Design a binder for this molecule. Structure first.
Ligand code: ARG
Ligand code: MG
Ligand code: MG
Ligand code: MG
Ligand code: MG
Ligand code: MG
Ligand code: MG
Ligand code: MG
Ligand code: MG
Ligand code: MG
Ligand code: MG
Ligand code: MG
Ligand code: MG
Ligand code: MG
Ligand code: MG
Ligand code: MG
Ligand code: MG
Ligand code: MG
Ligand code: MG
Ligand code: MG
Ligand code: MG
Ligand code: MG
Ligand code: MG
Ligand code: MG
Ligand code: MG
Ligand code: MG
Ligand code: MG
Ligand code: MG
Ligand code: MG
Ligand code: MG
Ligand code: MG
Ligand code: MG
Ligand code: MG
Ligand code: MG
Ligand code: MG
Ligand code: MG
Ligand code: MG
Ligand code: MG
Ligand code: MG
Ligand code: MG
Ligand code: MG
Ligand code: MG
Ligand code: MG
Ligand code: MG
Ligand code: MG
Ligand code: MG
Ligand code: MG
Ligand code: MG
Ligand code: MG
Ligand code: MG
Ligand code: MG
Ligand code: MG
Ligand code: MG
Ligand code: MG
Ligand code: MG
Ligand code: MG
Ligand code: MG
Ligand code: MG
Ligand code: MG
Ligand code: MG
Ligand code: MG
Ligand code: MG
Ligand code: MG
Ligand code: MG
Ligand code: MG
Ligand code: MG
Ligand code: MG
Ligand code: MG
Ligand code: MG
Ligand code: MG
Ligand code: MG
Ligand code: MG
Ligand code: MG
Ligand code: MG
Ligand code: MG
Ligand code: MG
Ligand code: MG
Ligand code: MG
Ligand code: MG
Ligand code: ZN
Ligand code: ZN
Lengths: 69, 53, 203, 116, 110, 181, 141
RNA sequence: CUGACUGGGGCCUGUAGAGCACUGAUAGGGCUAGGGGGCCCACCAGCCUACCAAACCCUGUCAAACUCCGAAGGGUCCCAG
RNA sequence: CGCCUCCUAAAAGGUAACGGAGGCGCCCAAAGGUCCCCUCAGGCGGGACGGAAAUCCGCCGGAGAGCGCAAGGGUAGAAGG
RNA sequence: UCCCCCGUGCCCAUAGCGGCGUGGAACCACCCGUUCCCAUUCCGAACACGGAAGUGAAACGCGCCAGCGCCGAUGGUACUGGGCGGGCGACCGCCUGGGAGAGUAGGUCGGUGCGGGGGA
């Protein structure tokens, strides 16, 4: 590589919020991120962050069967 | 040649004799031409400078 | 069928002399032979109008030989619309490219509706054994409307015969007919004047 | 893109900041800081990083927010517009939905006045 | 579709053969280096030399130089003196350059 | 050549599963990565403030490599484009920096994408290469909210040696590329 | 009626009319043809009168093939001017026709229909003509 | 003795004719973006066309300022009459 | 009304008409010398904003691009970058 | 002098495209590295250097195949130098010498010079 134009790559820590730490390389030796592949809901299986809903409507109402048959 | 593309002479800066006639575009090249050229009086190469024709 | 035609040999006779004596000049060739021939014009014409590069013509020669040929090329006098020269292609035992007459069976529904069946190809180019030459190739065109079409990829070929043209080649179409009711439209149809392609600084 | 994907303002208190999130109002701001025991009056510039992911964790796991919320609200307006019910028709035309008079006003739904 | 390699070679060599001198052509493989002095009017090679044919040692640059001296010594015993250097597709540098310097040390004129 | 986990994962895990999935008979036949070309079609810096040096300072932090200037082929009136004008950045990543970039790309960048639902499975070259665009540059771990000024995305070309899209799908998915379909 | 939609040049030199027709001497499409027996510049007006005469005889049915096209600009100086002052103005368009050329072909129609339509068409043209029927010679071309 | 003219040999050429590979023109058919129109629709798509029709392909043609070709001749030099 | 390009011009050169078509009366301090390096237009597929067409990637692609400006000749084994 | 390879010419596609097959001992290439020379409008991709673990996958070389591309007769015709006729003309014929283009038959998956390395 040409000299004096490229940011030097050094060994680097990456600390995600989920405690996962990656041993990679970067121009910054230590970086904090809010998410990573180890915890992101698309990555960690069908980790439905909230809406493990199912249908949900238009029948799980069932309030109720009091009308006659 | 035109109003903006003028004719000019090149003058040997050592002996002051005009040895070459040439042209330039004084809008594109507003500074005086400085060029090395053979001066047959000095019998060597010399900085010649643009001088009014 | 299998037609026969007397042929004769010629060396330095001049073609205009042979043609003035009623003889059509010609040539015979394949990878093995090449001989200058002439046939009799009225005799050749009787045969060719039936045989016509489609069916085999056997040339009876004056040395006793007989050779099975396809007419490979007919050169016409462009002014008088007359044959001036024939190429006879002497068949060998290997297959050969050639044109097999197309034969359009049935009446199209478009033709019933007033349309016209455009027979684009009336024969089709094909590799086949010179002992395998079918008389024709039937094609059902009764389901063509205005304006449907048929291609060589729809040819149901007999056995031994391989298509020698692109399957995407059109063989027939059924088109709208001439109609007087369109005339007054075309008469009172103003067509603007021709544009002249810009030249030089304007392009 | 701190929490949750929205870079909430510093300089402001946490309860006030978290309102700058699609899905979190004054009500849910009180709920997030109590359930994680954070002083609701602490500026975002002063949250210990332990507090942040503590606050971040509870918020993102509890409630639907930003894109997932917006896709859902749209999906409900979409299904109403597909099943062809009356409310769906009002969304089809951009007219109001909750029974309001349209002879005048309704400028929020219709937009600025179109001359004739 | 010519490659940049073939264009570079044609371009360098057309200019050489325009001057009508015997050309000193140089082929540089990953392992070896080779040299021919060629009369392009007869389409005929006059004298050769290469690392492969002299079964030469290790460092490619010093090998190249020795190839040049060898080519020179055989060339002069045939009357060859003046010549035009044909770097062909290579920069005038390193191994090729060393071979040229080695040819000149041996009295080849160029 | 540095020791980077993604490169090691390529040789130790990825290659064996690829040889087994396709039965290659030569070690040079197994798909590998040729290069990763990052491109910014900026153009919002054409005349305005051709101080895209802001972006070059960014891509250099992201890749450890100084990007190079792309200049306009012809002039385009509707785009307000003069032939020769600087309209973006291309940087070509190979060998360890290519691995080092892709390593952080799969681990950190793609997860930070807004409403991320996986890479587009249909984006494949048709000859075994892949391409994806990005909407922002904060996606990357080195570019923080403080230092940024404007929202500039990029194109990323992933060039493999695979002859077909299927072999390339296999190689990339195995490296940790999250596809939705 | 027929004329080029565009052209590189507005005006053409006159040239000659020697020789049999260059090509187009065999029936290529329909069943019957109208062959030119002597050379001429056939005007776009003449072709259209020939076409309309065949359409009108068919009433409804058949197909006409026009195998010549008037691309040659025809020039005439304004009336009562002297020689000089440049080339005349384009007044029309003509197709060059030489002996043996198949000008029109018809299909989709009886023999009697075709014979008669080609005859009436021939009366609209400034030359002698011949009616022909597709032959094996035509097919071998 | 070199001349007109002539024999032989070499080189130069883009016409006649022809051709369609380039630049344009071109009839029909095929295939087929884009429009016209027709069902169906506004919830964004969908189907249908004996309508006009680009590109491409086939068949068939046109050209002083078109040429993938290309004569007869013409020019010029050498040796000979 | 001088000059350039094509055609007319009959395959050397030349060849007229108030015959058919276009351009010039500048420009460039690099758009000049040399050395080294590089190769187009266009089609298809892929790619945030980004579109018929901006920049990126892959495959095909001998010259249809380019060569300041008319036209012609020439030209990537460069005269183009 | 015969076969393989590496250089480098010549003929100028009968030499090209495509498909398939084959070769690593040798040679060539990819390859292994980027300290050193040198290098990237960024990139050891290229250029360059130092190497020698691997692979003939890519490239290259060598076979085979006629789908494309390229080449292509013979015969006949167009045209025509020179010589003659005919038509009011547009134009049309005859003699003698020359003779295409398209198309048909068919050909082609190159040939050859010089040097170098290896083999028998
Ligand atoms: N060399 C020749 N014979 N030329 C003859 C020229 C044509 C002549 N006018 C003819 O048709 O008879
Ligand atoms: Mg350096
Ligand atoms: Mg240095
Ligand atoms: Mg008869
Ligand atoms: Mg101009
Ligand atoms: Mg809120
Ligand atoms: Mg109300
Ligand atoms: Mg109301
Ligand atoms: Mg490997
Ligand atoms: Mg795809
Ligand atoms: Mg690939
Ligand atoms: Mg970041
Ligand atoms: Mg005239
Ligand atoms: Mg008239
Ligand atoms: Mg006139
Ligand atoms: Mg006049
Ligand atoms: Mg006139
Ligand atoms: Mg008229
Ligand atoms: Mg004609
Ligand atoms: Mg009449
Ligand atoms: Mg023909
Ligand atoms: Mg004498
Ligand atoms: Mg003399
Ligand atoms: Mg003579
Ligand atoms: Mg002609
Ligand atoms: Mg054409
Ligand atoms: Mg053709
Ligand atoms: Mg003509
Ligand atoms: Mg012509
Ligand atoms: Mg001409
Ligand atoms: Mg011509
Ligand atoms: Mg051909
Ligand atoms: Mg030829
Ligand atoms: Mg001659
Ligand atoms: Mg002449
Ligand atoms: Mg002569
Ligand atoms: Mg003379
Ligand atoms: Mg001569
Ligand atoms: Mg004499
Ligand atoms: Mg002339
Ligand atoms: Mg001329
Ligand atoms: Mg001349
Ligand atoms: Mg002269
Ligand atoms: Mg005048
Ligand atoms: Mg003027
Ligand atoms: Mg410069
Ligand atoms: Mg391109
Ligand atoms: Mg595209
Ligand atoms: Mg887009
Ligand atoms: Mg684009
Ligand atoms: Mg050009
Ligand atoms: Mg070789
Ligand atoms: Mg030779
Ligand atoms: Mg194949
Ligand atoms: Mg191979
Ligand atoms: Mg080996
Ligand atoms: Mg081995
Ligand atoms: Mg270093
Ligand atoms: Mg060192
Ligand atoms: Mg390297
Ligand atoms: Mg190298
Ligand atoms: Mg090694
Ligand atoms: Mg191989
Ligand atoms: Mg092998
Ligand atoms: Mg190579
Ligand atoms: Mg064979
Ligand atoms: Mg030839
Ligand atoms: Mg031929
Ligand atoms: Mg002949
Ligand atoms: Mg004569
Ligand atoms: Mg006369
Ligand atoms: Mg004759
Ligand atoms: Mg003769
Ligand atoms: Mg000819
Ligand atoms: Mg021929
Ligand atoms: Mg071949
Ligand atoms: Mg060779
Ligand atoms: Mg040898
Ligand atoms: Mg040997
Ligand atoms: Zn994480
Ligand atoms: Zn002086």
């Amino acid at each position: 590589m040409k000299e004096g134009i490229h940011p030097k790559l050094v060994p680097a820590r990456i600390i995600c919020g989920c405690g996962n730490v990656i041993e990679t390389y970067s121009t910054k030796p230590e970086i904090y991120v809010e998410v990573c592949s180890k915890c992101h809901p698309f990555y960690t299986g069908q980790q439905r962050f909230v809406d493990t809903e199912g249908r949900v409507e238009r029948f799980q109402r069932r309030y109720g069967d009091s009308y006659r048959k | 040649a035109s109003e903006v593309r003028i004719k000019l002479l090149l003058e040997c800066t050592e002996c002051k004799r005009r040895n070459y006639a040439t042209e330039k575009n004084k809008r594109n090249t507003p500074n005086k031409l400085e060029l090395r050229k053979y001066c047959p009086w000095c019998r060597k190469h010399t900085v010649h400078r643009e001088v009014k024709i | 069928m299998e037609y026969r035609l007397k042929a004769y040999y010629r060396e330095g006779e001049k073609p205009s002399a042979l043609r003035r004596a009623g003889k059509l000049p010609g040539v015979m060739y394949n990878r093995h032979l090449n001989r200058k021939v002439y046939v009799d014009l009225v005799e050749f014409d009787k045969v060719f109008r039936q045989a016509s590069i489609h069916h085999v013509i056997v040339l009876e020669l004056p040395d006793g030989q007989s050779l099975p040929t396809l007419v490979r090329q007919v050169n016409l006098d462009k002014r008088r619309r007359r044959p001036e020269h024939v190429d006879f292609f002497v068949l060998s035992d290997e297959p050969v490219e050639m044109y097999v007459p197309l034969r359009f069976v049935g009446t199209p529904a478009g033709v019933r509706a007033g349309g016209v069946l455009q027979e684009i190809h009336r024969d089709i180019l094909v590799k086949v054994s010179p002992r395998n030459i079918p008389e024709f190739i039937e094609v059902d065109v009764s389901g063509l409307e205005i304006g449907d079409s048929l291609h060589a990829s729809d040819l149901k070929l007999p056995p031994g015969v391989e298509l020698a043209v692109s399957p995407e080649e059109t063989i027939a179409a059924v088109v709208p007919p001439e109609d007087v009711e369109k005339l007054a439209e075309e008469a009172a149809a103003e067509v603007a004047e021709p544009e002249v392609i810009k030249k030089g600084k304007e392009e | 893109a701190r929490i949750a994907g929205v870079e909430i303002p510093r300089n402001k208190r946490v309860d006030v900041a978290l309102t700058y999130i699609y899905g979190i109002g004054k009500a849910r701001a009180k709920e997030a800081l109590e359930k994680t025991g954070i002083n609701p009056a602490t500026r975002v510039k002063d949250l210990t990083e332990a507090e942040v992911v503590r606050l971040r964790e509870y918020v993102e796991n509890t409630w639907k927010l930003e894109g997932e919320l917006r896709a859902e609200v749209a999906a409900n307006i979409k299904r109403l517009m597909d099943i062809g019910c009356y409310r769906g028709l009002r969304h089809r035309r951009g007219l109001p939905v909750r029974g309001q008079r349209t002879r005048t006003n309704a400028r929020t739904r219709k937009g600025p006045r179109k001359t004739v | 579709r010519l490659t940049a390699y073939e264009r570079r070679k044609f371009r360098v060599r057309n200019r050489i053969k325009r001057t009508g001198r015997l050309r000193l052509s140089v082929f540089r493989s990953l392992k070896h280096i080779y040299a021919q002095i060629i009369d392009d009017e007869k389409g005929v090679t006059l004298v050769s030399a290469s690392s492969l044919a002299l079964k030469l040692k290790g460092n490619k640059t010093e090998v190249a130089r020795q190839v040049g001296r060898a080519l020179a010594e055989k060339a002069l015993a045939l009357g060859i003196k003046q010549v035009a250097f044909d770097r062909g597709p290579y920069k005038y540098h390193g191994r090729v350059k060393a071979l040229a310097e080695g040819a000149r040390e041996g009295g080849l004129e160029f | 050549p540095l020791d980077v986990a993604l490169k090691r994962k390529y040789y130790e895990e990825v290659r064996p599963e690829l040889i087994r999935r396709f039965g290659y008979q030569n070690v040079w036949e197994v798909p590998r990565l040729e290069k990763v070309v990052i491109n910014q079609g900026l153009g919002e810096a054409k005349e305005d403030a051709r101080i895209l040096e802001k972006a070059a300072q960014e891509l250099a932090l992201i890749t450890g490599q100084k990007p190079a200037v792309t200049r306009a082929k012809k002039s385009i009136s509707n785009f307000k484009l003069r032939k020769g004008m600087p309209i973006g950045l291309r940087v070509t990543l190979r060998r360890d920096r290519m691995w080092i970039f892709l390593e952080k790309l799969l681990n950190v960048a793609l997860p930070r994408i807004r409403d991320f639902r996986g890479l587009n499975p249909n984006s494949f070259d048709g000859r075994g290469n892949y391409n994806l665009g990005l909407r922002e540059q904060l996606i990357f771990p080195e570019i923080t909210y403080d230092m940024v000024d404007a929202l500039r995305g990029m194109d990323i070309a992933v060039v493999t040696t695979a002859e077909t899209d299927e072999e390339a799908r296999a190689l990339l998915e195995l490296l940790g590329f999250p596809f939705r379909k | 009626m027929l004329m080029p939609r565009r052209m590189k040049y507005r005006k053409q030199q006159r040239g000659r009319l020697k020789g049999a027709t260059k090509g187009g001497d065999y029936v290529a499409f329909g069943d019957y043809g109208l062959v030119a027996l002597e050379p001429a510049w056939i005007t776009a007006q003449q072709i259209e009168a020939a076409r309309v005469a065949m359409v009108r005889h068919f009433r409804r049915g058949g197909k006409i093939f026009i195998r010549i096209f008037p691309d040659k600009p025809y020039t005439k100086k304004p009336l009562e001017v002297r020689m000089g002052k440049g080339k005349g103005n384009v007044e029309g368009y003509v197709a060059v026709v030489k002996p043996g050329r198949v000008m029109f072909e018809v299909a989709g129609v009886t023999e009697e229909q075709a014979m008669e339509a080609l005859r009436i068409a021939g009366h609209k043209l400034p030359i002698k003509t011949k009616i022909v029927r597709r032959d094996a010679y035509d097919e071998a071309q």
